[PDB]
Amino acid sequence: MLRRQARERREYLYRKAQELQDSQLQQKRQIIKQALAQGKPLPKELAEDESLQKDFRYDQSLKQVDDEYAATSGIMDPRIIVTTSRDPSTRLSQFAKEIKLLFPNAVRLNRGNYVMPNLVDACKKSGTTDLVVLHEHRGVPTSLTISHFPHGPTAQFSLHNVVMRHDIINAGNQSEVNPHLIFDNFTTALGKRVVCILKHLFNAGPKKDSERVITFANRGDFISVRQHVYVRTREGVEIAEVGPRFEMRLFELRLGTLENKDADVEWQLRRFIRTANKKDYL
């Protein structure tokens, strides 16, 4: 096991490095294809590259979701573990339960004295696809980190204006159908990356008449999360909040499991640069 994971990751890192190099050659093959179809003369560098023209003959017959999810996207449903920080207060335990109910295939595991390297290794054995850890401050959730196994990525979020369902009187019980997912206003390449991470947490192929909808709405990089149950009426659709409400803002994203503090950082939040407030990345 441990050897294979190390070997596989090294093979992946090598593959990515080659692909970045191979990007230039891929563009060159596109120019050759366009010229042959349209008839325009080739550029000088291509016209003089005898090797590429020969290699093009074989490569003529060459033809999305992120790579880590590509293997199992839509094939195996995800398996999720939702845990918390050591000695969690009561409110975080209730919040952790709500996150467990949000995701259909989530399981709530108690973190009393579990060591973080031991935690991931136990989860990797049991086939867990994703791990969620929650932090709190005086019984108010503050952070949420999502780690995708076997080799990342790890996305860390900060939760604001959290309003739990336990704060509602006579709320009732949730419905646990495969919910419909709404991802609105995710445009940048990072935004697509964030959407892919959050999308694969849910089971594939919700029923067309499923009456539960989860929406992640990006509004100035503060991703709003809402949960609703709808009824299609004769002159429109009416919806009702099920909760919880919270706004989650990405502040880190690393290529590795949350245990590995050495994982290469794909993106971080730079708060002190001069033009920080000007642009919104998501």
Binding site: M1, L2, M76, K125, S126
Partner: protein, 410 residues
């Protein structure tokens, strides 16, 4: 692939999603669930026989799954791996539980007692360890490394004694009685151990052919030269016919192709062993073929509770005096087949129900074995059926209480 023998059809075929090779297999007693393990996946796939769908993929091993087996009674699944652990899965039931048991070394083979209460595992250290499933604690251990006979190959540069090539048992199996284990590996020995006392009953040499590579512990010094072993010199050139001279061997192959592909001599090894459900015999697959060892000749004299008064001569008068029960019991005490046969056929049909009820409980397993061995090839179909009817009616309750003592006989 599932085969139906009554019509010789591949009535169902299962396949994993991730394109995984399968090396071990185990089938539920109910014939409704099939599970297979791999050397490439670390997971035990499970399918439903009736529908063919993949029920689930059991995970938890950190090494490839080397073997599997279902309990005939309890229906638990016991799996072992090169992870140096054994896991008991309660897949049936509302709730799923896994109970891992650690071992000293890698596990290569596993056998389940017909009771379903214990499991024996052969490790790479050369140890057959028996564990109790319900308690998940060890109940015995058998050393095998000294027992195993392994031969130096012509190509090795190291002695057989220092050789660690095969000093473990890659397959094992219980006797249906539950008291004996027969083991074999990539070696020149089939060892039969007795579980309760942890002793080697007998050892069998698989082959005595020097054409096979692993037969001999000590090689002739004359073959060694400055050039090397004379056997390692390839003499294909001398062969008169072209098809003999041509060499088609791939440089690095070891298994999965024709002998010509190897370029090296076949190696003596026992791929698998099993006991006979119906007779006191066991079959061992090897390179030469399936060697079947049986006790059918039974030339041995193995009297049981014999005394001075019991004699082959003395038995005959008990027939002449019409004391059939005393004749029959005395026949078993000598345990002579020819005498038991003589008494068996001389008893009149009128007295069979009388005698059958009065046979001592100790000798009931023996007679049932005899009738089973005798009836298959004997011409007295009705007479045996009268006997079988008499015994089962008289001692049906006793047989049910002791199932595994009477399993092969029944």
């Amino acid at each position: 692939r599932a085969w139906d023998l009554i019509r010789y059809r591949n009535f169902r075929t299962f396949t994993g999603t991730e394109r995984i090779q399968f090396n071990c297999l185990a089938v539920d007693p109910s014939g409704e669930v099939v599970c297979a393990g791999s050397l490439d996946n670390f997971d035990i796939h499970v399918w439903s026989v009736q529908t063919g769908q993949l029920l689930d993929a059991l995970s938890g091993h950190e090494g490839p799954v080397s073997c599997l087996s279902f309990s005939q009674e309890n229906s638990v699944l016991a799996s072992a791996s090169w992870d140096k652990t054994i896991r008991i899965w309660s897949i049936f039931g509302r709730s799923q539980q896994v109970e891992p048991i650690e071992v000293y070394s890698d596990v290569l083979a596993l056998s389940m007692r017909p009771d379903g209460k214990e499991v024996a595992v052969s490790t790479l250290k050369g140890q057959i360890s028996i564990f109790n499933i319900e308690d998940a604690k060890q109940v015995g251990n058998i050393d095998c490394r000294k027992d195993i006979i392994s031969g130096r190959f012509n190509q090795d540069r190291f002695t057989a004694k220092n050789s660690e090539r095969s000093k473990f048992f890659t397959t094992i199996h219980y006797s249906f009685d539950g008291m004996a284990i027969v083991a074999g590996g990539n070696n020149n020995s089939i060892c039969l151990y007795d579980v309760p006392n942890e002793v080697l009953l007998k050892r069998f040499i698989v082959s005595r052919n020097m054409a096979l590579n692993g037969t001999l512990e000590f090689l002739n010094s004359k073959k060694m030269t400055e050039a090397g072993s004379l056997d390692l010199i390839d003499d294909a050139g001398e062969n008169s016919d072209l098809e003999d001279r041509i060499d088609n061997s791939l440089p690095g192959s070891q298994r999965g192709g024709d002998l010509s592909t190897r370029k090296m001599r076949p190696e003596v090894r026992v791929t698998s062993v099993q006991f006979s459900p119906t007779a006191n015999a066991f079959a061992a697959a090897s390179t030469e073929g399936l060697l079947i060892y049986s006790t059918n000749d039974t030339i041995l004299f193995d009297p049981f509770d014999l005394d001075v008064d019991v004699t082959p001569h003395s038995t005959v008068e008990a027939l002449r005096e019409k004391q059939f029960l005393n004749a029959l019991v005395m026949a078993f005490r000598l345990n002579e087949e020819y005498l038991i046969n003589k008494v068996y056929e001389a008893i009149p049909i009128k007295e069979i129900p009388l005698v059958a009820s009065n046979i001592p409980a100790i000798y009931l397993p023996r007679i049932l074995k005899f009738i089973g061995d005798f009836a298959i090839e004997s011409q007295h179909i009705e007479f045996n059926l009268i006997w079988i009817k008499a015994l089962l009616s008289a001692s049906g309750g006793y047989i049910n209480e002791h199932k595994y003592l009477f399993s092969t006989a029944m």
